[PDB]
Short mmCIF file of C-alpha atoms (C1' of nucleotides) and ligand atoms in Angstrom, two decimals:
data_model
loop_
_atom_site.label_atom_id
_atom_site.label_comp_id
_atom_site.label_asym_id
_atom_site.label_seq_id
_atom_site.Cartn_x
_atom_site.Cartn_y
_atom_site.Cartn_z
CA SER I 1 8.94 33.43 4.02
CA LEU I 2 5.55 31.23 4.05
CA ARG I 3 6.49 28.97 2.10
CA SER I 4 10.04 28.30 4.26
CA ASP I 5 8.09 28.53 7.53
CA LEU I 6 5.16 26.23 5.79
CA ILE I 7 7.93 23.25 5.72
CA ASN I 8 10.12 23.97 9.40
CA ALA I 9 6.68 23.88 10.49
CA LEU I 10 5.49 20.85 8.56
CA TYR I 11 8.47 18.92 9.45
CA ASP I 12 8.61 20.12 13.56
CA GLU I 13 5.85 19.12 14.05
CA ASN I 14 5.60 15.34 12.81
CA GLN I 15 8.18 14.51 13.98
CA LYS I 16 6.65 15.65 17.40
CA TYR I 17 4.05 14.37 17.06
CA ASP I 18 2.27 11.43 16.14
CA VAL I 19 -1.71 11.29 15.98
CA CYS I 20 -3.64 7.12 17.55
CA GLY I 21 -7.01 7.83 17.52
CA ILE I 22 -10.59 9.84 17.44
CA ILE I 23 -10.93 11.12 20.95
CA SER I 24 -15.28 11.99 22.42
CA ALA I 25 -15.14 15.07 25.14
CA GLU I 26 -16.48 11.87 28.12
CA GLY I 27 -13.16 11.60 27.03
CA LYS I 28 -13.34 7.85 25.45
CA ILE I 29 -10.01 6.35 22.62
CA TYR I 30 -10.93 5.23 19.78
CA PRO I 31 -7.81 3.81 17.87
CA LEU I 32 -7.82 4.16 14.06
CA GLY I 33 -7.43 1.93 10.87
CA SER I 34 -4.62 1.02 8.86
CA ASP I 35 -5.62 2.16 5.12
CA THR I 36 -4.89 5.43 3.77
CA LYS I 37 -8.68 6.17 3.54
CA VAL I 38 -8.40 6.65 7.43
CA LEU I 39 -4.73 8.18 7.46
CA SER I 40 -5.98 10.78 4.22
CA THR I 41 -8.38 12.04 6.28
CA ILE I 42 -5.91 12.17 9.22
CA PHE I 43 -3.21 13.64 7.84
CA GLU I 44 -4.78 16.44 6.35
CA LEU I 45 -6.63 17.37 10.36
CA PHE I 46 -3.00 17.05 11.65
CA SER I 47 -1.86 19.82 9.16
CA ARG I 48 -4.58 22.54 8.96
CA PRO I 49 -4.33 24.37 13.39
CA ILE I 50 0.15 24.50 11.28
CA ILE I 51 -1.36 25.87 8.15
CA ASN I 52 -2.87 28.43 9.70
CA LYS I 53 -0.34 29.30 12.31
CA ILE I 54 1.65 29.83 10.06
CA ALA I 55 -0.51 31.92 7.19
CA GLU I 56 -1.63 33.89 10.08
CA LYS I 57 2.23 34.89 11.46
CA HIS I 58 2.21 36.49 7.25
CA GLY I 59 -1.16 38.62 7.48
CA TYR I 60 -2.33 35.63 5.35
CA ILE I 61 -6.20 35.17 5.04
CA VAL I 62 -7.09 30.53 5.29
CA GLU I 63 -10.23 30.09 3.69
CA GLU I 64 -11.76 26.01 2.61
CA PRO I 65 -14.16 25.59 0.40
CA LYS I 66 -17.83 25.95 1.24
CA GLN I 67 -19.10 23.04 -1.59
CA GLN I 68 -17.20 19.47 -0.72
CA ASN I 69 -15.82 18.44 -4.55
CA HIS I 70 -14.21 21.86 -4.85
CA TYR I 71 -10.83 22.31 -5.67
CA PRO I 72 -7.78 22.86 -3.17
CA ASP I 73 -7.99 22.22 0.59
CA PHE I 74 -6.27 26.09 1.46
CA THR I 75 -6.56 28.82 0.04
CA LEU I 76 -4.22 31.48 1.21
CA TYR I 77 -4.22 35.30 0.39
CA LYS I 78 -3.78 38.50 1.89
CA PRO I 79 -6.67 41.71 1.60
CA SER I 80 -4.56 44.10 -0.10
CA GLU I 81 -3.80 41.44 -2.83
CA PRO I 82 -6.49 39.27 -3.83
CA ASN I 83 -5.14 38.13 -6.97
CA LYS I 84 -2.42 36.41 -5.25
CA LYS I 85 -3.68 33.63 -4.47
CA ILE I 86 -2.02 29.75 -2.97
CA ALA I 87 -3.48 27.32 -3.48
CA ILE I 88 -2.67 23.73 -1.37
CA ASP I 89 -3.80 20.51 -1.16
CA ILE I 90 -2.75 17.87 1.07
CA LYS I 91 -2.75 13.87 -0.78
CA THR I 92 -1.83 10.84 1.00
CA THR I 93 -0.25 7.37 -0.91
CA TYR I 94 1.78 4.32 0.98
CA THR I 95 4.54 2.20 1.16
CA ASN I 96 5.38 -1.47 2.79
CA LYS I 97 8.88 -0.39 3.19
CA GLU I 98 10.41 3.18 2.82
CA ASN I 99 12.68 3.01 0.77
CA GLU I 100 10.56 2.52 -2.64
CA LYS I 101 9.25 4.51 -5.07
CA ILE I 102 5.93 6.17 -4.13
CA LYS I 103 2.94 7.98 -6.69
CA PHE I 104 0.64 9.84 -5.54
CA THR I 105 -3.57 10.61 -7.00
CA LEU I 106 -2.64 14.72 -7.43
CA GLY I 107 -6.57 15.53 -9.04
CA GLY I 108 -8.37 16.21 -12.10
CA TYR I 109 -7.45 17.25 -15.68
CA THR I 110 -11.10 18.18 -16.72
CA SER I 111 -12.02 20.24 -13.74
CA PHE I 112 -10.35 24.03 -13.58
CA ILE I 113 -7.48 22.88 -15.39
CA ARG I 114 -9.74 23.67 -18.41
CA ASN I 115 -12.41 25.39 -16.92
CA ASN I 116 -10.98 28.47 -15.52
CA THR I 117 -14.66 28.76 -12.99
CA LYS I 118 -14.74 24.05 -12.51
CA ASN I 119 -14.69 22.83 -9.05
CA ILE I 120 -12.11 25.65 -8.08
CA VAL I 121 -13.45 28.36 -4.89
CA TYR I 122 -12.15 30.89 -6.23
CA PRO I 123 -11.09 31.73 -10.88
CA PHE I 124 -7.76 28.97 -11.42
CA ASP I 125 -6.29 32.52 -12.33
CA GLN I 126 -6.68 34.45 -9.42
CA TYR I 127 -3.73 32.05 -8.13
CA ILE I 128 -0.09 31.99 -9.00
CA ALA I 129 1.20 29.40 -7.28
CA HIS I 130 -0.52 25.79 -6.35
CA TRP I 131 1.64 23.87 -3.54
CA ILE I 132 0.62 19.97 -2.89
CA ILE I 133 1.27 19.17 0.57
CA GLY I 134 2.75 14.74 0.65
CA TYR I 135 2.40 12.78 3.45
CA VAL I 136 4.00 9.30 2.57
CA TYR I 137 3.02 6.67 6.07
CA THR I 138 4.96 3.20 6.06
CA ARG I 139 2.43 0.65 5.97
CA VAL I 140 2.50 -1.84 9.68
CA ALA I 141 2.24 -5.36 8.93
CA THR I 142 -0.46 -6.67 10.99
CA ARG I 143 -3.69 -6.98 8.56
CA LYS I 144 -5.73 -6.69 11.57
CA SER I 145 -6.06 -3.88 13.59
CA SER I 146 -7.32 -2.81 16.85
CA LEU I 147 -10.79 -3.39 18.23
CA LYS I 148 -11.21 -1.52 21.39
CA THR I 149 -11.11 1.33 23.07
CA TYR I 150 -8.42 3.30 25.94
CA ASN I 151 -8.53 6.05 28.07
CA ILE I 152 -6.68 8.95 28.49
CA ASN I 153 -4.66 6.64 30.80
CA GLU I 154 -3.84 4.54 28.20
CA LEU I 155 -2.38 6.34 25.59
CA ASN I 156 1.33 4.69 25.72
CA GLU I 157 -0.61 1.54 24.67
CA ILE I 158 -2.47 2.58 21.49
CA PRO I 159 -1.19 0.65 18.89
CA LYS I 160 -0.25 2.98 15.50
CA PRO I 161 -1.26 2.08 12.52
CA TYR I 162 1.12 2.95 10.24
CA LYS I 163 5.84 2.35 11.00
CA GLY I 164 6.69 5.98 10.06
CA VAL I 165 5.70 9.20 7.83
CA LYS I 166 7.31 11.27 5.85
CA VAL I 167 5.54 14.72 4.26
CA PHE I 168 6.98 17.47 2.34
CA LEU I 169 6.02 20.30 0.61
CA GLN I 170 6.02 20.89 -3.26
CA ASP I 171 4.53 23.05 -6.13
CA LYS I 172 2.19 20.87 -8.42
CA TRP I 173 4.38 21.29 -11.85
CA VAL I 174 7.43 20.22 -10.37
CA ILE I 175 5.93 16.75 -8.94
CA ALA I 176 3.27 15.90 -11.62
CA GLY I 177 3.80 12.76 -14.22
CA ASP I 178 3.35 12.57 -17.51
CA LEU I 179 0.97 9.27 -17.12
CA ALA I 180 -2.60 9.81 -15.63
CA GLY I 181 -2.70 8.71 -11.96
CA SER I 182 -6.96 7.00 -12.24
CA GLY I 183 -9.17 5.70 -14.80
CA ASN I 184 -12.73 6.40 -14.62
CA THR I 185 -11.65 9.82 -11.84
CA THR I 186 -9.38 11.55 -13.94
CA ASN I 187 -6.72 12.24 -12.29
CA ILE I 188 -2.93 13.51 -12.90
CA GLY I 189 -1.46 10.27 -11.69
CA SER I 190 3.22 12.48 -10.21
CA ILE I 191 6.22 11.24 -11.10
CA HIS I 192 6.64 7.49 -9.44
CA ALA I 193 9.68 8.25 -7.86
CA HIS I 194 11.72 7.70 -4.39
CA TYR I 195 10.25 10.07 -2.07
CA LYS I 196 14.23 12.89 -1.99
CA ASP I 197 13.17 13.12 -5.81
CA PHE I 198 9.72 14.74 -4.63
CA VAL I 199 11.62 17.73 -1.61
CA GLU I 200 13.94 18.24 -4.01
CA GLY I 201 12.36 18.60 -6.96
CA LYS I 202 13.29 16.26 -9.83
CA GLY I 203 9.88 15.59 -12.31
CA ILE I 204 10.18 15.36 -15.76
CA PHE I 205 8.44 19.07 -17.34
CA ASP I 206 10.80 21.87 -17.79
CA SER I 207 7.70 24.22 -16.64
CA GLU I 208 4.90 24.58 -15.14
CA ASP I 209 3.00 26.53 -18.84
CA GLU I 210 4.41 22.52 -20.41
CA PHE I 211 2.68 21.05 -17.29
CA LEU I 212 -0.31 23.12 -18.45
CA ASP I 213 -0.34 22.16 -21.91
CA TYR I 214 0.32 18.06 -21.28
CA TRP I 215 -2.81 17.95 -18.94
CA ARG I 216 -4.86 20.22 -21.20
CA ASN I 217 -4.79 17.87 -24.61
CA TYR I 218 -4.30 14.18 -22.77
CA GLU I 219 -7.27 12.35 -23.86
CA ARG I 220 -8.89 10.47 -21.61
CA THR I 221 -8.68 6.61 -23.30
CA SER I 222 -5.67 5.27 -24.51
CA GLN I 223 -7.46 4.37 -28.74
CA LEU I 224 -8.21 8.49 -28.29
CA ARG I 225 -4.42 8.93 -26.86
CA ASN I 226 -2.45 6.48 -29.57
CA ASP I 227 -3.12 9.03 -32.69
CA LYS I 228 -1.91 12.69 -29.67
CA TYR I 229 0.03 11.80 -27.96
CA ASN I 230 0.29 8.96 -24.30
CA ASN I 231 3.71 10.51 -22.53
CA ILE I 232 5.65 13.19 -22.65
CA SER I 233 8.18 12.13 -25.65
CA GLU I 234 4.97 11.99 -27.51
CA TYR I 235 4.13 15.34 -26.10
CA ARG I 236 7.58 17.21 -27.58
CA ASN I 237 6.85 15.21 -30.60
CA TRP I 238 2.69 16.17 -31.05
CA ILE I 239 3.66 19.95 -30.51
CA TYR I 240 6.53 19.91 -33.23
CA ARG I 241 3.50 17.99 -35.87
CA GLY I 242 1.74 21.24 -35.82
CA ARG I 243 -0.84 20.29 -32.69
CA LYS I 244 -2.01 17.57 -34.20
CA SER H 1 -31.49 -11.13 18.52
CA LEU H 2 -27.65 -9.68 17.09
CA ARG H 3 -29.26 -7.27 15.23
CA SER H 4 -31.50 -5.60 17.38
CA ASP H 5 -28.12 -6.37 20.18
CA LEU H 6 -26.06 -4.51 17.36
CA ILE H 7 -29.12 -1.28 17.26
CA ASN H 8 -29.03 -0.57 20.82
CA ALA H 9 -25.42 -0.65 21.03
CA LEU H 10 -25.16 1.65 18.48
CA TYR H 11 -27.98 3.90 19.02
CA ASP H 12 -27.03 4.14 22.79
CA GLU H 13 -23.56 4.52 21.94
CA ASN H 14 -24.22 7.74 19.40
CA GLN H 15 -26.21 8.79 22.73
CA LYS H 16 -23.47 9.22 24.91
CA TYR H 17 -20.48 9.81 23.35
CA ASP H 18 -19.49 12.93 21.05
CA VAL H 19 -16.25 12.41 18.93
CA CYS H 20 -15.00 16.01 19.43
CA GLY H 21 -11.24 15.20 17.52
CA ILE H 22 -8.08 13.14 16.46
CA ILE H 23 -5.49 12.88 19.59
CA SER H 24 -2.13 12.08 19.15
CA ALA H 25 0.22 10.13 21.73
CA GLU H 26 1.56 13.51 22.87
CA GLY H 27 -2.11 14.40 24.72
CA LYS H 28 -2.17 16.95 21.19
CA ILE H 29 -5.63 17.66 20.10
CA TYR H 30 -6.23 18.77 17.04
CA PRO H 31 -10.08 19.73 15.71
CA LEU H 32 -11.91 17.41 13.66
CA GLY H 33 -13.23 19.50 9.26
CA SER H 34 -17.42 19.56 9.45
CA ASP H 35 -17.91 17.95 5.93
CA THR H 36 -18.48 14.17 4.87
CA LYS H 37 -15.14 13.27 4.18
CA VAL H 38 -14.23 13.17 7.55
CA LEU H 39 -17.08 12.42 8.99
CA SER H 40 -17.31 9.52 7.66
CA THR H 41 -14.17 8.73 8.69
CA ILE H 42 -15.23 8.99 12.15
CA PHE H 43 -18.65 7.11 12.37
CA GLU H 44 -16.84 4.70 10.91
CA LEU H 45 -13.92 3.74 13.80
CA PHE H 46 -17.19 5.28 15.79
CA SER H 47 -18.17 1.84 14.87
CA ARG H 48 -15.88 -0.80 14.78
CA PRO H 49 -15.25 -1.59 18.76
CA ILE H 50 -19.25 -1.59 19.33
CA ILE H 51 -19.50 -4.66 15.59
CA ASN H 52 -16.92 -6.40 17.38
CA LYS H 53 -18.52 -6.44 21.08
CA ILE H 54 -21.49 -7.22 20.48
CA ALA H 55 -20.21 -10.19 17.46
CA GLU H 56 -18.66 -12.46 20.46
CA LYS H 57 -21.21 -11.90 22.50
CA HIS H 58 -23.24 -13.66 19.82
CA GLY H 59 -20.35 -16.16 19.64
CA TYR H 60 -19.52 -14.39 15.27
CA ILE H 61 -15.92 -13.26 14.45
CA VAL H 62 -15.34 -10.55 12.96
CA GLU H 63 -12.92 -9.34 9.66
CA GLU H 64 -12.19 -6.22 8.02
CA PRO H 65 -11.10 -5.75 4.31
CA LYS H 66 -7.36 -7.46 3.67
CA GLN H 67 -6.70 -5.01 0.36
CA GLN H 68 -8.51 -1.48 0.68
CA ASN H 69 -10.50 -1.80 -2.60
CA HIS H 70 -13.10 -4.38 -0.42
CA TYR H 71 -16.47 -5.00 0.00
CA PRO H 72 -17.54 -5.00 3.32
CA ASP H 73 -16.28 -2.96 5.75
CA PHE H 74 -17.21 -5.67 8.28
CA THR H 75 -17.48 -10.20 7.83
CA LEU H 76 -18.52 -11.81 10.81
CA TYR H 77 -19.81 -15.02 10.96
CA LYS H 78 -19.48 -18.31 13.20
CA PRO H 79 -16.90 -20.42 12.89
CA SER H 80 -19.38 -23.79 12.85
CA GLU H 81 -21.49 -22.33 9.57
CA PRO H 82 -18.31 -20.50 7.09
CA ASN H 83 -21.19 -20.27 3.86
CA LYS H 84 -23.48 -17.47 6.74
CA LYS H 85 -21.66 -14.78 6.36
CA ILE H 86 -23.00 -11.25 7.83
CA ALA H 87 -21.73 -7.81 5.45
CA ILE H 88 -21.84 -4.72 7.19
CA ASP H 89 -21.24 -1.72 6.02
CA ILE H 90 -21.32 1.87 7.15
CA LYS H 91 -22.66 5.19 5.23
CA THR H 92 -22.56 8.28 5.67
CA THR H 93 -24.18 11.43 4.52
CA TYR H 94 -25.16 14.46 5.84
CA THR H 95 -28.43 17.04 6.59
CA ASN H 96 -28.76 20.97 6.47
CA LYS H 97 -31.18 21.06 9.04
CA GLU H 98 -33.03 18.34 10.70
CA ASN H 99 -35.93 16.11 9.23
CA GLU H 100 -35.28 17.33 5.37
CA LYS H 101 -35.13 13.26 2.10
CA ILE H 102 -31.55 12.02 2.85
CA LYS H 103 -30.42 9.77 0.05
CA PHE H 104 -26.82 7.41 0.26
CA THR H 105 -24.52 6.44 -2.73
CA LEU H 106 -24.35 2.68 -1.30
CA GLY H 107 -21.80 1.42 -3.24
CA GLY H 108 -20.97 -0.19 -7.07
CA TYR H 109 -23.71 -2.06 -8.57
CA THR H 110 -20.57 -3.18 -11.19
CA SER H 111 -19.03 -5.46 -8.66
CA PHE H 112 -19.88 -8.06 -6.10
CA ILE H 113 -22.99 -8.40 -7.37
CA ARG H 114 -22.38 -9.63 -10.84
CA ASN H 115 -19.15 -11.59 -10.42
CA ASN H 116 -19.21 -13.18 -7.95
CA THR H 117 -15.69 -12.74 -6.18
CA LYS H 118 -15.05 -8.87 -7.50
CA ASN H 119 -13.83 -6.54 -5.27
CA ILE H 120 -15.34 -8.73 -1.96
CA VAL H 121 -13.67 -10.08 1.41
CA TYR H 122 -15.31 -13.39 0.87
CA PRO H 123 -17.37 -14.47 -2.66
CA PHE H 124 -20.83 -13.12 -2.77
CA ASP H 125 -23.33 -16.45 -2.83
CA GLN H 126 -21.71 -17.16 1.37
CA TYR H 127 -23.27 -13.90 2.03
CA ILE H 128 -26.51 -14.43 4.05
CA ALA H 129 -27.69 -10.91 4.71
CA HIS H 130 -26.36 -7.26 3.79
CA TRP H 131 -26.44 -4.40 6.70
CA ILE H 132 -25.98 -0.57 6.02
CA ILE H 133 -25.06 1.33 8.44
CA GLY H 134 -25.79 4.92 8.29
CA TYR H 135 -25.61 8.23 9.57
CA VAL H 136 -27.02 11.07 8.59
CA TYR H 137 -25.37 14.03 10.98
CA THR H 138 -26.31 17.70 10.46
CA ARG H 139 -23.84 19.89 8.92
CA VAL H 140 -22.42 23.61 11.43
CA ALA H 141 -20.39 25.76 9.59
CA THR H 142 -17.07 26.28 10.39
CA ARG H 143 -15.40 28.32 13.43
CA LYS H 144 -11.52 29.51 14.07
CA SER H 145 -11.35 28.18 17.64
CA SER H 146 -11.58 24.84 15.34
CA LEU H 147 -8.34 25.62 13.79
CA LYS H 148 -6.35 25.73 16.16
CA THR H 149 -4.92 22.12 19.18
CA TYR H 150 -6.44 21.56 22.70
CA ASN H 151 -4.79 19.55 25.19
CA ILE H 152 -6.87 16.66 27.73
CA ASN H 153 -8.48 19.47 30.19
CA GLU H 154 -9.74 21.15 27.21
CA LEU H 155 -11.99 18.34 25.76
CA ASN H 156 -14.89 20.61 26.44
CA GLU H 157 -13.71 23.76 25.09
CA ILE H 158 -13.40 21.61 21.02
CA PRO H 159 -15.98 22.59 19.39
CA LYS H 160 -17.91 19.84 17.50
CA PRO H 161 -18.58 19.81 13.94
CA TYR H 162 -22.02 18.20 13.71
CA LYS H 163 -25.24 20.09 15.07
CA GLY H 164 -26.80 15.85 16.10
CA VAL H 165 -25.72 13.09 14.74
CA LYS H 166 -28.55 10.03 14.55
CA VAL H 167 -27.91 6.25 13.45
CA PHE H 168 -29.63 3.14 11.54
CA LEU H 169 -29.33 -0.29 10.65
CA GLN H 170 -31.07 -1.53 7.70
CA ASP H 171 -30.92 -4.39 5.31
CA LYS H 172 -29.51 -2.89 1.79
CA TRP H 173 -31.60 -4.59 -0.04
CA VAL H 174 -34.37 -2.95 1.67
CA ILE H 175 -33.43 1.27 1.20
CA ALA H 176 -32.22 0.65 -2.33
CA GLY H 177 -33.60 3.07 -4.59
CA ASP H 178 -34.43 3.10 -8.33
CA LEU H 179 -31.30 5.72 -9.30
CA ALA H 180 -28.01 5.37 -9.16
CA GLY H 181 -26.18 7.78 -7.05
CA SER H 182 -23.03 8.05 -8.57
CA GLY H 183 -22.02 8.52 -12.61
CA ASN H 184 -18.62 8.30 -13.25
CA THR H 185 -18.37 5.98 -9.31
CA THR H 186 -21.29 3.24 -10.90
CA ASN H 187 -22.82 2.92 -7.15
CA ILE H 188 -26.17 1.39 -6.22
CA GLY H 189 -28.36 5.11 -4.83
CA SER H 190 -30.94 5.02 -2.41
CA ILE H 191 -34.47 5.30 -2.18
CA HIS H 192 -34.95 9.50 -1.59
CA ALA H 193 -36.44 10.03 1.52
CA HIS H 194 -36.46 11.31 5.31
CA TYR H 195 -34.56 9.27 8.28
CA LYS H 196 -37.95 6.63 9.78
CA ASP H 197 -38.81 5.31 6.38
CA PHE H 198 -35.14 4.08 6.35
CA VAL H 199 -35.59 3.11 10.04
CA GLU H 200 -38.73 1.29 8.90
CA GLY H 201 -37.88 -0.04 5.97
CA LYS H 202 -40.27 1.62 3.69
CA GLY H 203 -39.02 1.03 0.16
CA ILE H 204 -39.26 -0.29 -2.97
CA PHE H 205 -38.01 -3.22 -4.05
CA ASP H 206 -40.97 -6.15 -3.20
CA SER H 207 -38.29 -8.76 -2.46
CA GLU H 208 -34.13 -8.43 -2.26
CA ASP H 209 -33.80 -10.98 -5.20
CA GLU H 210 -35.54 -8.55 -7.64
CA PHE H 211 -32.96 -5.19 -6.11
CA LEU H 212 -30.17 -8.01 -7.76
CA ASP H 213 -32.16 -7.93 -10.75
CA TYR H 214 -32.87 -5.05 -10.53
CA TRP H 215 -29.31 -3.95 -10.33
CA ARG H 216 -27.87 -6.17 -12.19
CA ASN H 217 -29.02 -5.72 -15.15
CA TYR H 218 -29.33 -1.74 -15.32
CA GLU H 219 -27.79 0.10 -17.70
CA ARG H 220 -24.91 2.37 -17.18
CA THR H 221 -25.79 5.92 -18.82
CA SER H 222 -29.80 7.09 -20.17
CA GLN H 223 -29.01 6.21 -23.66
CA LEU H 224 -28.48 2.77 -23.13
CA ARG H 225 -31.25 3.10 -20.79
CA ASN H 226 -33.77 4.58 -22.77
CA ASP H 227 -34.87 1.35 -24.34
CA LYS H 228 -34.78 -0.57 -21.51
CA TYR H 229 -36.31 0.55 -17.99
CA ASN H 230 -34.92 3.88 -16.17
CA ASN H 231 -36.53 3.19 -13.15
CA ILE H 232 -39.04 0.04 -10.95
CA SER H 233 -41.93 1.00 -13.35
CA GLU H 234 -39.87 0.20 -16.18
CA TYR H 235 -38.95 -2.49 -15.38
CA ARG H 236 -41.39 -4.42 -14.14
CA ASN H 237 -43.47 -3.41 -17.11
CA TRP H 238 -40.59 -5.31 -18.84
CA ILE H 239 -40.10 -7.76 -16.79
CA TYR H 240 -44.07 -8.39 -17.62
CA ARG H 241 -42.94 -8.29 -21.49
CA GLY H 242 -40.37 -10.85 -20.81
CA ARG H 243 -37.48 -8.42 -20.48
CA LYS H 244 -37.28 -7.30 -24.01
"C1'" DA U 1 -0.31 1.14 -18.39
"C1'" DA U 2 -4.67 1.45 -18.60
"C1'" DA U 3 -9.05 0.91 -16.52
"C1'" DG U 4 -11.96 0.61 -13.22
"C1'" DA U 5 -13.19 -0.76 -8.25
"C1'" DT U 6 -13.19 1.00 -3.13
"C1'" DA K 1 -14.99 7.57 0.95
"C1'" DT K 2 -19.25 10.64 -0.99
"C1'" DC K 3 -21.08 15.37 -3.65
"C1'" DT K 4 -23.32 19.09 -7.08
"C1'" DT K 5 -26.50 21.25 -9.95
"C1'" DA J 1 -31.75 12.94 -13.12
"C1'" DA J 2 -27.23 12.21 -15.12
"C1'" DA J 3 -23.26 12.67 -15.32
"C1'" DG J 4 -18.40 14.63 -14.02
"C1'" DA J 5 -16.40 16.52 -9.96
"C1'" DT J 6 -13.44 15.76 -5.02
"C1'" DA C 1 -11.07 10.52 -0.27
"C1'" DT C 2 -7.22 6.87 -3.59
"C1'" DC C 3 -6.63 2.06 -4.77
"C1'" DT C 4 -5.71 -2.58 -8.17
"C1'" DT C 5 -5.06 -5.72 -10.71
MG1 MG Z 301 -13.60 17.40 -0.28
MG1 MG Z 302 -8.27 17.93 0.59
MG1 MG Z 303 -12.06 0.10 1.69
MG1 MG Z 304 -16.63 2.08 4.57
#
DNA sequence: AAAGAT
DNA sequence: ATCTT
DNA sequence: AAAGAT
DNA sequence: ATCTT
């Protein structure tokens, strides 16, 4: 399927190529930095060609946002099935040691999930799936990156800003957690687990409907939350209480 | 001076080189996207080797943040004068057609400018200068060609996501405006003007001291600013009356 | 964690 | 990291 | 703009 | 665009 093909392609590409610099048309190569600010942008660009290749193979049109602060990164759909759109968003985070727990910021909880057309390319109801392609890289020990340039012949001497990288594709609701991922930018936090759990999809919500209801009613500050719910347990007790 | 040299080097590099993609160690090239999220990352990486080259020529050490949420992008200082550090921050914005008015988000106004050691590599008082290297690019409509990968022998064929790029170096206080550049992330907004005004330094503050005082007392919401000051005129009248 | 930095 | 209405 | 999206 | 305490 589109999903199984996309997952195989992502694994393959990631295993075969290592990004090491930005290149100018003149052949000069500028090395990379090791922070997520840099790598989140790189991994997103690294994914575009793959997604588009697999999408075309399945008769899907791929669309990117026109307004820069709109979701999702890629919208896929067959022209004949306009209301069966698939959303794909890329997220990046890091680890210091390969066997540690990770968590992602998965997007806002006050935009399109609460307002059907807010900051989204197409109305939320036209999407039947929301996939997250997550990249986890291991940071390099040296806090001092290369500060010079290279030429095409020196590709093998360019230090890579990461020790390793892992990728997975999973439905957003499945990896969503119950604690906000950011404060002032009101983001949904993912589960705080090991890589394996994201791949296998061992989440905390019972269904996508529960995931949505929980985040559509989550309050912004702990002050407001203490009278409603601060986690999944309290949310379920809040349902029992009659949503008051 | 270090300043005149840095400006010349940036200006020169920018005209002679055009970044067109990210390269993998195996020689595969991935095209760039056309939004600021991508270009701001590329321009920073582009600037790094140039800054380090000119700094070394003048006997300056160049240091980058150890932690991701620290300002500035680059700290420069001579080993013999540690209390005369120079901060350089790279800022990017876009334009739809050449010669339109532009504005930048210049960083927070509630961190290191209000607390000497908050989110900054070195205590704020050890810096004698705060420079902004700003990039302005004219956005270009993405095509189908920018959605496939390329090889080294095809460098000239890869379509560029920008029409033209202009760069400038100026003091932060000189280009700082009197209205916030962002709400929830509390950022200082720059003056809203044409590129030449940034180069020439036609701002609104009379001194760096006025810029600092203005932003150290600026309130986060218009409701809190209604009784204080919302712009430079009101701020001056407020000062005149005794800050009450 | 929550809140507020980049 | 900065954009949009 | 100011406020709230990414 | 995510991170840090
Ligand atoms: Mg965006
Ligand atoms: Mg994205
Ligand atoms: Mg940073
Ligand atoms: Mg920067």
